[PDB]
Scaffold this active site. Structure first.
Site, PDB file in Angstrom:
ATOM      1  N   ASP A  60      -5.788  10.295  37.695  1.00  0.00           N
ATOM      2  CA  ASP A  60      -4.849  10.733  38.721  1.00  0.00           C
ATOM      3  C   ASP A  60      -3.818   9.659  39.035  1.00  0.00           C
ATOM      4  O   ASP A  60      -2.970   9.844  39.904  1.00  0.00           O
ATOM      5  CB  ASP A  60      -5.597  11.122  39.997  1.00  0.00           C
ATOM      6  CG  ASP A  60      -6.492  12.330  39.802  1.00  0.00           C
ATOM      7  OD1 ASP A  60      -6.340  13.019  38.768  1.00  0.00           O
ATOM      8  OD2 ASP A  60      -7.343  12.595  40.680  1.00  0.00           O
ATOM      9  N   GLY A 129      -7.746  25.579  44.455  1.00  0.00           N
ATOM     10  CA  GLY A 129      -8.674  25.190  45.501  1.00  0.00           C
ATOM     11  C   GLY A 129      -9.561  24.045  45.052  1.00  0.00           C
ATOM     12  O   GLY A 129      -9.764  23.843  43.855  1.00  0.00           O
ATOM     13  N   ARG A 134     -13.419  26.597  44.496  1.00  0.00           N
ATOM     14  CA  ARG A 134     -13.527  27.246  43.196  1.00  0.00           C
ATOM     15  C   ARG A 134     -14.922  27.824  42.976  1.00  0.00           C
ATOM     16  O   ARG A 134     -15.080  28.852  42.317  1.00  0.00           O
ATOM     17  CB  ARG A 134     -13.168  26.270  42.074  1.00  0.00           C
ATOM     18  CG  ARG A 134     -11.759  25.713  42.180  1.00  0.00           C
ATOM     19  CD  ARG A 134     -11.336  25.007  40.905  1.00  0.00           C
ATOM     20  NE  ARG A 134      -9.996  24.442  41.019  1.00  0.00           N
ATOM     21  CZ  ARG A 134      -9.308  23.938  40.000  1.00  0.00           C
ATOM     22  NH1 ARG A 134      -9.834  23.931  38.782  1.00  0.00           N
ATOM     23  NH2 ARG A 134      -8.094  23.443  40.198  1.00  0.00           N
TER      24      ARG A 134
END
Ligand SMILES: Cc1[nH]c(Cc2[nH]cc(CCC(=O)O)c2CC(=O)O)c(CCC(=O)O)c1CC(=O)O
Length: 312
Positions: A60, A129, A134
């Site tokens: 990320d 989500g 999920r």
């Protein structure tokens, strides 16, 4: 000078950060810490000197951190593989034995592209989500026969039980730095940089340097159809990289290797956004060259085109 540790409010984030603080407290028994609960905000908290270190998922983090910032630690890598979590009725099955036209959920180009190619008769639909959201959708609503998630994320949550299938590289390769944690700190902050360095795992560092260099030289980001696979065995560091069109129709997959003995410890700049002065630079450099080499080998075969098209 107590160690302030910035972290997101989400459950998974807070778990990840805790495991780091836990490992810092193992090496610095008495050392005092303090936890302080769209990640640029935390970065702004580093600038305001409100926080001293932030814990990210490596994948990320941009291949280039903003000026003044750096990744002080690449922790030991967890399980890098992608996983499948099946609908309750399909419990026990694999993607390979699912009914045709079964909808699998995933908002990942990398995952979608690769799985449409290996499983043409399965439909791959996006899903939104957090990890829990999920799971509510997969179980309650009647739309998804399965979903795709990182094994490492389920393991940290304690949802290891829900893992139905551990995807192999020959079915789906993982995102760069998947399963590995990165500690982001101020580059002009030698004190924190010194402490945090214990967290460097040599093997993981070299491997994630290969992967980030590779991705960096393809000018790729977090959400691009690019996967990798790294391994170290008997001096050799192996890198496998691939690109895909959104649908995975056309692909380029190559593997190169470098003789890099896995290191012991100890003013040169960071590599692909990573400071690690406490471990020999020869191998770090050598692992970067691996990324560059492979990246160029893929570009030589039109990878850039495949990527420019992929961009909607
Ligand atoms: C770069 C990135 N970050 C995350 C979201 C993310 N970021 C970190 C984790 C957990 C594992 C880790 O921390 O490495 C997850 C969730 C997951 O990958 O299942 C996803 C997946 C989004 C989706 O589920 O469609 C991707 C794309 C990719 O991996 O190709």
């Amino acid at each position: 000078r107590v160690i302030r540790v910035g972290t997101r409010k989400s459950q998974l984030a807070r778990i990840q950060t805790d495991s780091v603080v836990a490992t810092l407290k193992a090496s610095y028994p008495g050392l005092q810490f303090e936890i302080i609960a769209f990640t640029k905000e935390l970065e702004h908290a580093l600038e305001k000197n409100e926080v001293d270190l932030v814990v990210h998922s490596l994948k990320d983090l941009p291949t280039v951190l903003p000026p003044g910032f750096t990744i002080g630690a690449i922790c030991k890598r967890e399980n890098p593989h992608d996983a499948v979590v099946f609908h309750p009725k399909f419990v026990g099955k694999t993607l390979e034995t699912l009914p045709e036209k079964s909808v699998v959920g995933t908002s990942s180009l990398r995952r979608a592209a690769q799985l449409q190619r290996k499983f043409p008769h399965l439909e791959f639909r996006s899903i939104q989500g957090n990890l829990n959201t999920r799971l509510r959708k997969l179980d309650e609503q009647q739309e998804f026969s399965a979903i795709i998630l990182a094994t490492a994320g389920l393991q940290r949550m304690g949802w290891h039980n829900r893992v139905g299938q551990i995807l192999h590289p020959e079915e789906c390769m993982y995102a760069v730095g998947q399963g590995a944690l990165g500690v982001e700190v101020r580059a002009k902050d030698q004190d924190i940089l010194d402490l945090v360095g214990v967290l460097h795992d040599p093997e993981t560092l070299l491997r994630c340097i290969a992967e980030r260099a590779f991705l960096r030289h393809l000018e790729g980001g977090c959400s691009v159809p690019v996967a990798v696979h790294t391994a170290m065995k008997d001096g050799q560091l192996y890198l496998t990289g691939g690109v895909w069109s959104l649908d995975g129709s056309d692909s380029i997959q190559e593997t190169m290797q470098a003789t890099i003995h896995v290191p012991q410890h100890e003013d040169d700049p960071q590599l692909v956004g990573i400071t690690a002065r406490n471990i020999p630079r020869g191998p770090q450099l050598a692992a970067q060259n691996l990324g560059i080499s492979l990246a160029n080998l893929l570009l030589s075969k039109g990878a850039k085109n495949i990527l420019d098209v992929a961009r909607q």
